[PDB]
Amino acid sequence: PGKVFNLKKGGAVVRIVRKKEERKTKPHQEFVKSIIQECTGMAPYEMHIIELLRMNKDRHALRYAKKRLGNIKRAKAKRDQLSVYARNI
Amino acid sequence: GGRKRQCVHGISYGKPRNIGIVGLKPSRSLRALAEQKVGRRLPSLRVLNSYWVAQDGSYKWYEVILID
Amino acid sequence: INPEALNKHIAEIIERATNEKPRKFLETVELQVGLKGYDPKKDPRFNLPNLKLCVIADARDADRAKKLGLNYVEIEHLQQFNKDAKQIKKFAKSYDVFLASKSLIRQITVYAGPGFTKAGRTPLPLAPDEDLELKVLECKVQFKKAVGLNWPIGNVKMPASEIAQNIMTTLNFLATQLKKGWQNIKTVYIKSTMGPSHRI
Amino acid sequence: VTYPAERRTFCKREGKHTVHKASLYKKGKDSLLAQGKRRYDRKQRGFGGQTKPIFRRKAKTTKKQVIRLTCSSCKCQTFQVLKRCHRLEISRL
RNA sequence: AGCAGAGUGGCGCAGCGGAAGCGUAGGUCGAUGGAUCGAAACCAUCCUCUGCUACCA
RNA sequence: GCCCCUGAGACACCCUGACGGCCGCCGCCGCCCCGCUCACCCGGUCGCGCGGGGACCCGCCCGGGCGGGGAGUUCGGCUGGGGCGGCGCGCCUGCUACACCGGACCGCAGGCGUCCCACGGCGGGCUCAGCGAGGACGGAGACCUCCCGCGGAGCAGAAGGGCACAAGCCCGCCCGACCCGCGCCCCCCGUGCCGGCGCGGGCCGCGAAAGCGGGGCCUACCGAUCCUUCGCCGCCCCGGCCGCG
RNA sequence: ACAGCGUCGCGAGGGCCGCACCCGGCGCUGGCGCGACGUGAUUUCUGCCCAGUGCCACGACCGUCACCGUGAAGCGAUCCGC
RNA sequence: CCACGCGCCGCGGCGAGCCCGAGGGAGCCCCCGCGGCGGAGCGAGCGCGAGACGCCCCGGGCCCGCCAUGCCCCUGCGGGCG
């Protein structure tokens, strides 16, 4: 156990306030990425995830991204970003 | 590449744990070693920081800011 | 796996099938369950739970069968069956469903026991008190060594939706008697006795 | 030595003597994810050669055979260690 | 240990479920179980044997 | 075509499964070849009026071999010096061992590392090895008989103990050759271990019961820490919670 | 040690050595050469054995024998095949 | 010999307490000065958690935790009483 057992925990009023909205991506940054996306296209691995996504092979895509990036959160989120391109097509 | 120990005839005599010449990896990065190489070449200047500018199969290139 | 498209195809087949269709919904529904991941040496073989039928019984069970009109017979033919091995097979092949008598089951264990066991069709003993018709209503999941699995969904004229429920009940049971379950099945088709296959 | 296919023995879950099927116990394959195996693969990682003793002086010719008695009713699993023996068979049903 | 392949007349050795032969009278087809209408054969289990590889029991 | 026909499998009709084989197809996945020059790599020259290769090698990173060419180390003990051999190097019986107990010996005669779901448990019945004298074949010899039978037989294997309405033999059931928690003895520092033994509480077996049974009559027949593997029930994963681990 | 005698490897993109690397020796060389070994001037000769153990095959690639790559499965660590 | 750690003995101060810690204080031997150690144990942990005697010593009895087990019942794989 990592917490002391006090049933009446709460002797002082607590001002827990992160007072923070989730960090906004920011409109200007999205615009700069759009200009770069036109100039640079997409990385070879991203195109291969898109081809696996165009065919219905989503587990293959997640496994290929998890090998490419090395973290499930960023593998899933890359699969869901690149899927918009294939879904738009 | 990876560090190769400077042992003559490629043999390190001693406890077998300290054996091994070709498999060792550098302690400092190739960014740090680039910074240390220019510092010897240019002892008078003061090294600020370095940035990576290119990489090939055999070589890696780092550009160092040096201040007079 | 929408039931309606296939059920509607069976309803369209009511005009299309025609055929002799004795006691049938214009056809006897059949299912060809394709299997992937199936090996003969690997053992996923599970023998687990209108066609012509026979009941051989004593007093009351035969009398109820007589009013129903279901076949009613006696143990006397078992000496004649013993004379002709082919005759025991002839009795078995003609009547797809076999029923006997609990009271006369001693006769069915020795007099009928060898030929009917070799044939693989066993009469189901029905005592006079017991009702044969309700047992007949009760009248299959098998894997054997064949990847293709074939079973008559329903020889009944019962609505295609009731027939669809019978297909569903066996598919889930097959998923239970399969290592990868639904994954193991590949392609299944529904067709009328002379009708075209329609993938599920 | 011949062991019977079924022996009636006490099953702890039921708490009563019940019929138990018999079956030879075999050591399972070693898991890479084990306290010792994780430590051993780290110790043997790198230069220095073997870091752990490798026994090479076998002397026992026989092992001790454990029979897994599995109760049909409670699925209780009990193990009976027989005396060391060169050959063992479990009678068929 | 793992992965293969073998074990058959007196001797050796073919036979791919449907004569058990040939070469030099002559069959626990190493046995056991299953499986099949029937296996030397398929499938297990073991007694082996061979080749290769593996190592804190 | 059926109802035939009798076959492992029923050959009117319709649909699919396997097994091959043969096209084809695919924004699919491996593999192999051939250019080209533009990295890369050489030769020539006083770059004086030129070539040879080439996406290959090489280098680097993982991976598998070969590798006393080298390193680092090890290479037991007991013992009429040591070696050679053996093993009082773990365990057991009768000795030598000197009548409690304890006594050394490269002292003696021997064993053990196994074998048995019966060669176990229990109850009932029975008597064994053999003399003598008898009974077609049948004789030294089987088989069937009576008698008298202290065990002269048997009890898995060494030796010594033990045992007769039995501990032997046969027969009928059975699995206690279970589960849980302790103590005692032998060796002994009086520590472990093997082996036994005595119990408290479950659940069983056999027997009419009383009883007896945690193997095989007793004395031999085996094994720390760590690691692994498995079973039984729970706890923990430390800011939580859930599945896996 | 020697002259002599054999054996062995090698056509330079090569062989054999050096060497922490960078890179050198043979080599201002080239098979009448260079490197590696035996035996040891003549004279007369050098039999048999490829079992074993070495060595050798652009001799095959049968069985094993790695990363990678790949194909299922999984929530994913992973796990099986190929 | 000295340092350091551990065991035991004796002695001094104080007592369910005890203590020149580092430090600070115009301040050197003075004053002030936390952890810690003891006062509760046991259990892998979850966790739970001591009174009944007793000049002393020992032995017995009982209580606490761990390990079972039987009942009872609240706020319930929870509590209690054996």
mmCIF file with all atom_site columns, all heavy atoms in Angstrom, chain F residues 200-207:
data_model
loop_
_atom_site.group_PDB
_atom_site.id
_atom_site.type_symbol
_atom_site.label_atom_id
_atom_site.label_alt_id
_atom_site.label_comp_id
_atom_site.label_asym_id
_atom_site.label_entity_id
_atom_site.label_seq_id
_atom_site.pdbx_PDB_ins_code
_atom_site.Cartn_x
_atom_site.Cartn_y
_atom_site.Cartn_z
_atom_site.occupancy
_atom_site.B_iso_or_equiv
_atom_site.pdbx_formal_charge
_atom_site.auth_seq_id
_atom_site.auth_comp_id
_atom_site.auth_asym_id
_atom_site.auth_atom_id
_atom_site.pdbx_PDB_model_num
ATOM 1   P P     . G F 1 200 ? -3.918  -40.264 20.175 1.00 0.00 ? 200 G F P     1
ATOM 2   O OP1   . G F 1 200 ? -4.623  -40.687 21.444 1.00 0.00 ? 200 G F OP1   1
ATOM 3   O OP2   . G F 1 200 ? -4.153  -41.180 18.977 1.00 0.00 ? 200 G F OP2   1
ATOM 4   O "O5'" . G F 1 200 ? -4.400  -38.774 19.816 1.00 0.00 ? 200 G F "O5'" 1
ATOM 5   C "C5'" . G F 1 200 ? -4.213  -37.737 20.808 1.00 0.00 ? 200 G F "C5'" 1
ATOM 6   C "C4'" . G F 1 200 ? -4.375  -36.398 20.141 1.00 0.00 ? 200 G F "C4'" 1
ATOM 7   O "O4'" . G F 1 200 ? -3.193  -36.120 19.350 1.00 0.00 ? 200 G F "O4'" 1
ATOM 8   C "C3'" . G F 1 200 ? -5.511  -36.307 19.120 1.00 0.00 ? 200 G F "C3'" 1
ATOM 9   O "O3'" . G F 1 200 ? -6.793  -36.101 19.693 1.00 0.00 ? 200 G F "O3'" 1
ATOM 10  C "C2'" . G F 1 200 ? -5.048  -35.125 18.267 1.00 0.00 ? 200 G F "C2'" 1
ATOM 11  O "O2'" . G F 1 200 ? -5.377  -33.875 18.828 1.00 0.00 ? 200 G F "O2'" 1
ATOM 12  C "C1'" . G F 1 200 ? -3.541  -35.348 18.222 1.00 0.00 ? 200 G F "C1'" 1
ATOM 13  N N9    . G F 1 200 ? -3.101  -36.035 17.016 1.00 0.00 ? 200 G F N9    1
ATOM 14  C C8    . G F 1 200 ? -2.669  -37.332 16.909 1.00 0.00 ? 200 G F C8    1
ATOM 15  N N7    . G F 1 200 ? -2.337  -37.668 15.688 1.00 0.00 ? 200 G F N7    1
ATOM 16  C C5    . G F 1 200 ? -2.569  -36.521 14.944 1.00 0.00 ? 200 G F C5    1
ATOM 17  C C6    . G F 1 200 ? -2.394  -36.283 13.561 1.00 0.00 ? 200 G F C6    1
ATOM 18  O O6    . G F 1 200 ? -1.986  -37.068 12.694 1.00 0.00 ? 200 G F O6    1
ATOM 19  N N1    . G F 1 200 ? -2.753  -34.980 13.221 1.00 0.00 ? 200 G F N1    1
ATOM 20  C C2    . G F 1 200 ? -3.222  -34.032 14.093 1.00 0.00 ? 200 G F C2    1
ATOM 21  N N2    . G F 1 200 ? -3.513  -32.831 13.579 1.00 0.00 ? 200 G F N2    1
ATOM 22  N N3    . G F 1 200 ? -3.386  -34.249 15.394 1.00 0.00 ? 200 G F N3    1
ATOM 23  C C4    . G F 1 200 ? -3.045  -35.510 15.748 1.00 0.00 ? 200 G F C4    1
ATOM 24  P P     . G F 1 201 ? -8.112  -36.845 19.102 1.00 0.00 ? 201 G F P     1
ATOM 25  O OP1   . G F 1 201 ? -9.288  -36.553 20.007 1.00 0.00 ? 201 G F OP1   1
ATOM 26  O OP2   . G F 1 201 ? -7.830  -38.323 18.878 1.00 0.00 ? 201 G F OP2   1
ATOM 27  O "O5'" . G F 1 201 ? -8.387  -36.118 17.686 1.00 0.00 ? 201 G F "O5'" 1
ATOM 28  C "C5'" . G F 1 201 ? -8.821  -34.739 17.703 1.00 0.00 ? 201 G F "C5'" 1
ATOM 29  C "C4'" . G F 1 201 ? -8.663  -34.138 16.329 1.00 0.00 ? 201 G F "C4'" 1
ATOM 30  O "O4'" . G F 1 201 ? -7.306  -34.328 15.861 1.00 0.00 ? 201 G F "O4'" 1
ATOM 31  C "C3'" . G F 1 201 ? -9.482  -34.780 15.210 1.00 0.00 ? 201 G F "C3'" 1
ATOM 32  O "O3'" . G F 1 201 ? -10.866 -34.444 15.233 1.00 0.00 ? 201 G F "O3'" 1
ATOM 33  C "C2'" . G F 1 201 ? -8.749  -34.244 13.980 1.00 0.00 ? 201 G F "C2'" 1
ATOM 34  O "O2'" . G F 1 201 ? -9.137  -32.934 13.635 1.00 0.00 ? 201 G F "O2'" 1
ATOM 35  C "C1'" . G F 1 201 ? -7.298  -34.298 14.450 1.00 0.00 ? 201 G F "C1'" 1
ATOM 36  N N9    . G F 1 201 ? -6.592  -35.466 13.943 1.00 0.00 ? 201 G F N9    1
ATOM 37  C C8    . G F 1 201 ? -6.237  -36.600 14.629 1.00 0.00 ? 201 G F C8    1
ATOM 38  N N7    . G F 1 201 ? -5.626  -37.482 13.879 1.00 0.00 ? 201 G F N7    1
ATOM 39  C C5    . G F 1 201 ? -5.584  -36.896 12.620 1.00 0.00 ? 201 G F C5    1
ATOM 40  C C6    . G F 1 201 ? -5.036  -37.376 11.406 1.00 0.00 ? 201 G F C6    1
ATOM 41  O O6    . G F 1 201 ? -4.467  -38.454 11.193 1.00 0.00 ? 201 G F O6    1
ATOM 42  N N1    . G F 1 201 ? -5.210  -36.455 10.373 1.00 0.00 ? 201 G F N1    1
ATOM 43  C C2    . G F 1 201 ? -5.827  -35.236 10.492 1.00 0.00 ? 201 G F C2    1
ATOM 44  N N2    . G F 1 201 ? -5.903  -34.486 9.386  1.00 0.00 ? 201 G F N2    1
ATOM 45  N N3    . G F 1 201 ? -6.335  -34.777 11.631 1.00 0.00 ? 201 G F N3    1
ATOM 46  C C4    . G F 1 201 ? -6.179  -35.656 12.647 1.00 0.00 ? 201 G F C4    1
ATOM 47  P P     . G F 1 202 ? -11.984 -35.412 14.560 1.00 0.00 ? 202 G F P     1
ATOM 48  O OP1   . G F 1 202 ? -13.303 -35.165 15.261 1.00 0.00 ? 202 G F OP1   1
ATOM 49  O OP2   . G F 1 202 ? -11.501 -36.849 14.559 1.00 0.00 ? 202 G F OP2   1
ATOM 50  O "O5'" . G F 1 202 ? -12.077 -34.893 13.039 1.00 0.00 ? 202 G F "O5'" 1
ATOM 51  C "C5'" . G F 1 202 ? -12.021 -35.871 11.976 1.00 0.00 ? 202 G F "C5'" 1
ATOM 52  C "C4'" . G F 1 202 ? -11.635 -35.191 10.687 1.00 0.00 ? 202 G F "C4'" 1
ATOM 53  O "O4'" . G F 1 202 ? -10.196 -35.015 10.660 1.00 0.00 ? 202 G F "O4'" 1
ATOM 54  C "C3'" . G F 1 202 ? -11.961 -35.975 9.411  1.00 0.00 ? 202 G F "C3'" 1
ATOM 55  O "O3'" . G F 1 202 ? -13.279 -35.691 8.946  1.00 0.00 ? 202 G F "O3'" 1
ATOM 56  C "C2'" . G F 1 202 ? -10.855 -35.520 8.459  1.00 0.00 ? 202 G F "C2'" 1
ATOM 57  O "O2'" . G F 1 202 ? -11.142 -34.293 7.826  1.00 0.00 ? 202 G F "O2'" 1
ATOM 58  C "C1'" . G F 1 202 ? -9.672  -35.421 9.415  1.00 0.00 ? 202 G F "C1'" 1
ATOM 59  N N9    . G F 1 202 ? -8.951  -36.674 9.608  1.00 0.00 ? 202 G F N9    1
ATOM 60  C C8    . G F 1 202 ? -8.780  -37.345 10.793 1.00 0.00 ? 202 G F C8    1
ATOM 61  N N7    . G F 1 202 ? -8.082  -38.446 10.673 1.00 0.00 ? 202 G F N7    1
ATOM 62  C C5    . G F 1 202 ? -7.766  -38.500 9.322  1.00 0.00 ? 202 G F C5    1
ATOM 63  C C6    . G F 1 202 ? -7.021  -39.465 8.605  1.00 0.00 ? 202 G F C6    1
ATOM 64  O O6    . G F 1 202 ? -6.480  -40.493 9.032  1.00 0.00 ? 202 G F O6    1
ATOM 65  N N1    . G F 1 202 ? -6.949  -39.143 7.252  1.00 0.00 ? 202 G F N1    1
ATOM 66  C C2    . G F 1 202 ? -7.511  -38.039 6.665  1.00 0.00 ? 202 G F C2    1
ATOM 67  N N2    . G F 1 202 ? -7.322  -37.903 5.348  1.00 0.00 ? 202 G F N2    1
ATOM 68  N N3    . G F 1 202 ? -8.201  -37.121 7.336  1.00 0.00 ? 202 G F N3    1
ATOM 69  C C4    . G F 1 202 ? -8.292  -37.416 8.654  1.00 0.00 ? 202 G F C4    1
ATOM 70  P P     . C F 1 203 ? -14.432 -36.851 8.848  1.00 0.00 ? 203 C F P     1
ATOM 71  O OP1   . C F 1 203 ? -15.728 -36.161 8.653  1.00 0.00 ? 203 C F OP1   1
ATOM 72  O OP2   . C F 1 203 ? -14.255 -37.775 9.993  1.00 0.00 ? 203 C F OP2   1
ATOM 73  O "O5'" . C F 1 203 ? -14.072 -37.641 7.514  1.00 0.00 ? 203 C F "O5'" 1
ATOM 74  C "C5'" . C F 1 203 ? -13.981 -36.953 6.256  1.00 0.00 ? 203 C F "C5'" 1
ATOM 75  C "C4'" . C F 1 203 ? -13.028 -37.676 5.337  1.00 0.00 ? 203 C F "C4'" 1
ATOM 76  O "O4'" . C F 1 203 ? -11.731 -37.775 5.977  1.00 0.00 ? 203 C F "O4'" 1
ATOM 77  C "C3'" . C F 1 203 ? -13.389 -39.115 5.012  1.00 0.00 ? 203 C F "C3'" 1
ATOM 78  O "O3'" . C F 1 203 ? -14.312 -39.199 3.925  1.00 0.00 ? 203 C F "O3'" 1
ATOM 79  C "C2'" . C F 1 203 ? -12.040 -39.699 4.617  1.00 0.00 ? 203 C F "C2'" 1
ATOM 80  O "O2'" . C F 1 203 ? -11.731 -39.365 3.285  1.00 0.00 ? 203 C F "O2'" 1
ATOM 81  C "C1'" . C F 1 203 ? -11.087 -38.966 5.562  1.00 0.00 ? 203 C F "C1'" 1
ATOM 82  N N1    . C F 1 203 ? -10.730 -39.740 6.760  1.00 0.00 ? 203 C F N1    1
ATOM 83  C C2    . C F 1 203 ? -9.816  -40.788 6.639  1.00 0.00 ? 203 C F C2    1
ATOM 84  O O2    . C F 1 203 ? -9.328  -41.034 5.527  1.00 0.00 ? 203 C F O2    1
ATOM 85  N N3    . C F 1 203 ? -9.480  -41.501 7.738  1.00 0.00 ? 203 C F N3    1
ATOM 86  C C4    . C F 1 203 ? -10.024 -41.201 8.919  1.00 0.00 ? 203 C F C4    1
ATOM 87  N N4    . C F 1 203 ? -9.664  -41.930 9.977  1.00 0.00 ? 203 C F N4    1
ATOM 88  C C5    . C F 1 203 ? -10.958 -40.137 9.070  1.00 0.00 ? 203 C F C5    1
ATOM 89  C C6    . C F 1 203 ? -11.277 -39.437 7.974  1.00 0.00 ? 203 C F C6    1
ATOM 90  P P     . C F 1 204 ? -15.376 -40.424 3.765  1.00 0.00 ? 204 C F P     1
ATOM 91  O OP1   . C F 1 204 ? -16.386 -40.010 2.764  1.00 0.00 ? 204 C F OP1   1
ATOM 92  O OP2   . C F 1 204 ? -15.830 -40.883 5.108  1.00 0.00 ? 204 C F OP2   1
ATOM 93  O "O5'" . C F 1 204 ? -14.517 -41.574 3.077  1.00 0.00 ? 204 C F "O5'" 1
ATOM 94  C "C5'" . C F 1 204 ? -14.372 -42.865 3.690  1.00 0.00 ? 204 C F "C5'" 1
ATOM 95  C "C4'" . C F 1 204 ? -13.081 -43.498 3.238  1.00 0.00 ? 204 C F "C4'" 1
ATOM 96  O "O4'" . C F 1 204 ? -12.008 -43.068 4.114  1.00 0.00 ? 204 C F "O4'" 1
ATOM 97  C "C3'" . C F 1 204 ? -13.019 -45.012 3.320  1.00 0.00 ? 204 C F "C3'" 1
ATOM 98  O "O3'" . C F 1 204 ? -13.622 -45.636 2.196  1.00 0.00 ? 204 C F "O3'" 1
ATOM 99  C "C2'" . C F 1 204 ? -11.518 -45.259 3.346  1.00 0.00 ? 204 C F "C2'" 1
ATOM 100 O "O2'" . C F 1 204 ? -10.915 -45.188 2.069  1.00 0.00 ? 204 C F "O2'" 1
ATOM 101 C "C1'" . C F 1 204 ? -11.028 -44.088 4.200  1.00 0.00 ? 204 C F "C1'" 1
ATOM 102 N N1    . C F 1 204 ? -10.833 -44.429 5.618  1.00 0.00 ? 204 C F N1    1
ATOM 103 C C2    . C F 1 204 ? -9.710  -45.176 5.980  1.00 0.00 ? 204 C F C2    1
ATOM 104 O O2    . C F 1 204 ? -8.917  -45.533 5.097  1.00 0.00 ? 204 C F O2    1
ATOM 105 N N3    . C F 1 204 ? -9.519  -45.494 7.279  1.00 0.00 ? 204 C F N3    1
ATOM 106 C C4    . C F 1 204 ? -10.396 -45.093 8.201  1.00 0.00 ? 204 C F C4    1
ATOM 107 N N4    . C F 1 204 ? -10.167 -45.431 9.471  1.00 0.00 ? 204 C F N4    1
ATOM 108 C C5    . C F 1 204 ? -11.550 -44.331 7.859  1.00 0.00 ? 204 C F C5    1
ATOM 109 C C6    . C F 1 204 ? -11.724 -44.019 6.569  1.00 0.00 ? 204 C F C6    1
ATOM 110 P P     . G F 1 205 ? -14.561 -46.909 2.405  1.00 0.00 ? 205 G F P     1
ATOM 111 O OP1   . G F 1 205 ? -15.415 -47.100 1.171  1.00 0.00 ? 205 G F OP1   1
ATOM 112 O OP2   . G F 1 205 ? -15.318 -46.759 3.706  1.00 0.00 ? 205 G F OP2   1
ATOM 113 O "O5'" . G F 1 205 ? -13.531 -48.136 2.533  1.00 0.00 ? 205 G F "O5'" 1
ATOM 114 C "C5'" . G F 1 205 ? -12.685 -48.448 1.405  1.00 0.00 ? 205 G F "C5'" 1
ATOM 115 C "C4'" . G F 1 205 ? -11.567 -49.345 1.867  1.00 0.00 ? 205 G F "C4'" 1
ATOM 116 O "O4'" . G F 1 205 ? -10.792 -48.660 2.880  1.00 0.00 ? 205 G F "O4'" 1
ATOM 117 C "C3'" . G F 1 205 ? -11.987 -50.633 2.577  1.00 0.00 ? 205 G F "C3'" 1
ATOM 118 O "O3'" . G F 1 205 ? -12.381 -51.679 1.701  1.00 0.00 ? 205 G F "O3'" 1
ATOM 119 C "C2'" . G F 1 205 ? -10.703 -50.985 3.327  1.00 0.00 ? 205 G F "C2'" 1
ATOM 120 O "O2'" . G F 1 205 ? -9.787  -51.726 2.554  1.00 0.00 ? 205 G F "O2'" 1
ATOM 121 C "C1'" . G F 1 205 ? -10.157 -49.612 3.704  1.00 0.00 ? 205 G F "C1'" 1
ATOM 122 N N9    . G F 1 205 ? -10.392 -49.282 5.103  1.00 0.00 ? 205 G F N9    1
ATOM 123 C C8    . G F 1 205 ? -11.279 -48.367 5.609  1.00 0.00 ? 205 G F C8    1
ATOM 124 N N7    . G F 1 205 ? -11.263 -48.304 6.918  1.00 0.00 ? 205 G F N7    1
ATOM 125 C C5    . G F 1 205 ? -10.309 -49.239 7.295  1.00 0.00 ? 205 G F C5    1
ATOM 126 C C6    . G F 1 205 ? -9.864  -49.619 8.584  1.00 0.00 ? 205 G F C6    1
ATOM 127 O O6    . G F 1 205 ? -10.234 -49.183 9.682  1.00 0.00 ? 205 G F O6    1
ATOM 128 N N1    . G F 1 205 ? -8.888  -50.612 8.513  1.00 0.00 ? 205 G F N1    1
ATOM 129 C C2    . G F 1 205 ? -8.406  -51.169 7.355  1.00 0.00 ? 205 G F C2    1
ATOM 130 N N2    . G F 1 205 ? -7.461  -52.109 7.487  1.00 0.00 ? 205 G F N2    1
ATOM 131 N N3    . G F 1 205 ? -8.821  -50.817 6.143  1.00 0.00 ? 205 G F N3    1
ATOM 132 C C4    . G F 1 205 ? -9.773  -49.855 6.188  1.00 0.00 ? 205 G F C4    1
ATOM 133 P P     . C F 1 206 ? -13.743 -52.554 1.943  1.00 0.00 ? 206 C F P     1
ATOM 134 O OP1   . C F 1 206 ? -14.239 -52.988 0.618  1.00 0.00 ? 206 C F OP1   1
ATOM 135 O OP2   . C F 1 206 ? -14.672 -51.836 2.865  1.00 0.00 ? 206 C F OP2   1
ATOM 136 O "O5'" . C F 1 206 ? -13.205 -53.849 2.693  1.00 0.00 ? 206 C F "O5'" 1
ATOM 137 C "C5'" . C F 1 206 ? -11.963 -54.449 2.299  1.00 0.00 ? 206 C F "C5'" 1
ATOM 138 C "C4'" . C F 1 206 ? -11.362 -55.199 3.454  1.00 0.00 ? 206 C F "C4'" 1
ATOM 139 O "O4'" . C F 1 206 ? -10.701 -54.257 4.338  1.00 0.00 ? 206 C F "O4'" 1
ATOM 140 C "C3'" . C F 1 206 ? -12.360 -55.897 4.359  1.00 0.00 ? 206 C F "C3'" 1
ATOM 141 O "O3'" . C F 1 206 ? -12.787 -57.161 3.875  1.00 0.00 ? 206 C F "O3'" 1
ATOM 142 C "C2'" . C F 1 206 ? -11.566 -56.035 5.647  1.00 0.00 ? 206 C F "C2'" 1
ATOM 143 O "O2'" . C F 1 206 ? -10.697 -57.145 5.602  1.00 0.00 ? 206 C F "O2'" 1
ATOM 144 C "C1'" . C F 1 206 ? -10.786 -54.721 5.673  1.00 0.00 ? 206 C F "C1'" 1
ATOM 145 N N1    . C F 1 206 ? -11.418 -53.675 6.496  1.00 0.00 ? 206 C F N1    1
ATOM 146 C C2    . C F 1 206 ? -11.123 -53.630 7.858  1.00 0.00 ? 206 C F C2    1
ATOM 147 O O2    . C F 1 206 ? -10.338 -54.465 8.329  1.00 0.00 ? 206 C F O2    1
ATOM 148 N N3    . C F 1 206 ? -11.689 -52.671 8.625  1.00 0.00 ? 206 C F N3    1
ATOM 149 C C4    . C F 1 206 ? -12.521 -51.784 8.077  1.00 0.00 ? 206 C F C4    1
ATOM 150 N N4    . C F 1 206 ? -13.060 -50.858 8.872  1.00 0.00 ? 206 C F N4    1
ATOM 151 C C5    . C F 1 206 ? -12.841 -51.809 6.690  1.00 0.00 ? 206 C F C5    1
ATOM 152 C C6    . C F 1 206 ? -12.273 -52.762 5.944  1.00 0.00 ? 206 C F C6    1
ATOM 153 P P     . G F 1 207 ? -14.327 -57.558 3.978  1.00 0.00 ? 207 G F P     1
ATOM 154 O OP1   . G F 1 207 ? -14.597 -58.733 3.065  1.00 0.00 ? 207 G F OP1   1
ATOM 155 O OP2   . G F 1 207 ? -15.175 -56.328 3.730  1.00 0.00 ? 207 G F OP2   1
ATOM 156 O "O5'" . G F 1 207 ? -14.511 -58.018 5.507  1.00 0.00 ? 207 G F "O5'" 1
ATOM 157 C "C5'" . G F 1 207 ? -13.781 -59.180 5.960  1.00 0.00 ? 207 G F "C5'" 1
ATOM 158 C "C4'" . G F 1 207 ? -13.627 -59.126 7.458  1.00 0.00 ? 207 G F "C4'" 1
ATOM 159 O "O4'" . G F 1 207 ? -12.915 -57.923 7.843  1.00 0.00 ? 207 G F "O4'" 1
ATOM 160 C "C3'" . G F 1 207 ? -14.912 -59.032 8.280  1.00 0.00 ? 207 G F "C3'" 1
ATOM 161 O "O3'" . G F 1 207 ? -15.621 -60.259 8.345  1.00 0.00 ? 207 G F "O3'" 1
ATOM 162 C "C2'" . G F 1 207 ? -14.330 -58.562 9.613  1.00 0.00 ? 207 G F "C2'" 1
ATOM 163 O "O2'" . G F 1 207 ? -13.708 -59.609 10.325 1.00 0.00 ? 207 G F "O2'" 1
ATOM 164 C "C1'" . G F 1 207 ? -13.323 -57.520 9.133  1.00 0.00 ? 207 G F "C1'" 1
ATOM 165 N N9    . G F 1 207 ? -13.904 -56.185 9.062  1.00 0.00 ? 207 G F N9    1
ATOM 166 C C8    . G F 1 207 ? -14.454 -55.573 7.964  1.00 0.00 ? 207 G F C8    1
ATOM 167 N N7    . G F 1 207 ? -14.941 -54.386 8.224  1.00 0.00 ? 207 G F N7    1
ATOM 168 C C5    . G F 1 207 ? -14.702 -54.208 9.579  1.00 0.00 ? 207 G F C5    1
ATOM 169 C C6    . G F 1 207 ? -15.012 -53.112 10.420 1.00 0.00 ? 207 G F C6    1
ATOM 170 O O6    . G F 1 207 ? -15.563 -52.045 10.118 1.00 0.00 ? 207 G F O6    1
ATOM 171 N N1    . G F 1 207 ? -14.596 -53.343 11.729 1.00 0.00 ? 207 G F N1    1
ATOM 172 C C2    . G F 1 207 ? -13.972 -54.479 12.171 1.00 0.00 ? 207 G F C2    1
ATOM 173 N N2    . G F 1 207 ? -13.653 -54.512 13.468 1.00 0.00 ? 207 G F N2    1
ATOM 174 N N3    . G F 1 207 ? -13.677 -55.515 11.389 1.00 0.00 ? 207 G F N3    1
ATOM 175 C C4    . G F 1 207 ? -14.068 -55.310 10.108 1.00 0.00 ? 207 G F C4    1
#
